[PDB]
Design a binder for this molecule. Structure first.
Ligand code: NI
Length: 341
């Protein structure tokens, strides 16, 4: 049974609610982005209207085989009428094709559902600037002040400088980057650009990347692993055993691996600056954990909410424990008292 924080009152709509069977009263199912916890339940047998971005609809059709007649892609930053209700899709600064959804209810209430997002000051000059928002369905993944991490730009500078140094010292070093979902493509694309290489990967991952509308992508990726010195592997294989085994398969072309695991936050963030990050090393294999986040830090979240000034907040993450729910409610009240709304 569909939980209340996935339902939009005063409409026939749900958000990210495909794992509950036929939801009573639902006339249109929205999908914020193509991450498995959110699409859970969709397949070629789904026969209700799905509303999403162009990029998410490419993934639904090619990866999950949803039939074309049920996919309803909408342009961004554009007022659209869906089943009698005005909606807008906004870029969520999460993974490719990820959106926030503005719903303009027939009674005059305005609701923003962030999906998953990484708040940014640039959002303060989107179509959000233009009206009041009553209710905020908020991605609270990192809603506690311990969650700090650097900008994506600082993290990418670290990765590029680290990979270029290693491979210039040793032209026989291979770079490997872990992945298990879409998102974070800048990590492996920036490293391959500095090295003058295409990124090599499985046919299944190439297929996924080809759905993403990234400019000049045919110039940047390949399935020919032998021609590439940046390889993508499943995240599960980014350990000493898995990397040893990969280096065997390369036929003595390489004699060292430098590997990256883009995580979200880890508690090494509470002590260490990006500049000071060091790898775990065993023999000729080194593994860097880099804090590349596609969700808001606590401070970025707080700035967005204090700017928006919603009347009510409904968290969408960390809702399963009373301690989490009580912590989040305390911060929402602090923010409101400090800013005066
Ligand atoms: Ni996500």
């Amino acid at each position: 049974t569909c939980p209340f924080y996935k339902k939009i009152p005063g409409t026939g709509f749900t958000v990210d609610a495909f794992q509950y069977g036929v939801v009573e009263g639902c006339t249109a199912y929205f999908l914020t982005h193509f991450h498995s916890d959110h699409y859970a339940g969709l397949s070629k047998h789904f026969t209700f209207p799905v509303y999403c971005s162009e990029i998410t609809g490419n993934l639904l059709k090619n990866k999950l085989h949803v039939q074309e007649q049920y996919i309803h892609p909408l342009p961004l930053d554009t007022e659209c009428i869906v089943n009698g209700v005005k909606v807008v899709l906004l870029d969520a600064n999460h993974c490719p094709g990820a959106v926030m959804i503005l719903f303009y209810l027939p009674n005059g209430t305005v609701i923003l559902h962030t999906g998953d997002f990484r708040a940014d000051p640039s959002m303060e000059r989107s179509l959000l600037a233009d009206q009041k928002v009553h209710m905020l369905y908020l991605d609270t993944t990192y809603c506690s002040p311990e969650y700090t991490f650097p900008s994506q730009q600082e993290v990418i500078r670290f990765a590029i400088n680290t990979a270029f140094e290693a491979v210039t010292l040793n032209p026989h070093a291979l770079v490997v980057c872990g992945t298990y979902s879409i998102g974070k493509e800048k990590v492996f694309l920036a490293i391959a650009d500095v090295l003058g290489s295409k990124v090599g990967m499985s046919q299944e991952k190439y297929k996924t990347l080809q759905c993403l509308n990234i400019p000049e992508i045919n110039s940047l990726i390949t399935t020919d692993m032998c021609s590439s010195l940046v390889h993508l592997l499943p995240m599960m294989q980014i350990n000493f055993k898995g990397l040893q085994s990969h280096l065997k398969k390369c036929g003595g072309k390489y004699n060292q691996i430098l590997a990256f695991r883009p995580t979200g936050w880890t508690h090494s963030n509470k002590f260490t600056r990006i500049a000071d990050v060091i790898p775990q090393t065993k023999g000729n294999i080194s593994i860097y954990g880099i804090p590349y986040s596609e969700h808001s830090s606590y401070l970025e979240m707080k700035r967005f909410v204090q700017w928006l000034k919603p009347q009510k907040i409904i968290p969408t993450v960390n809702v399963g424990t009373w301690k989490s729910r009580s912590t989040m409610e305390k911060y929402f009240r602090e923010w409101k008292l400090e800013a005066g709304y």
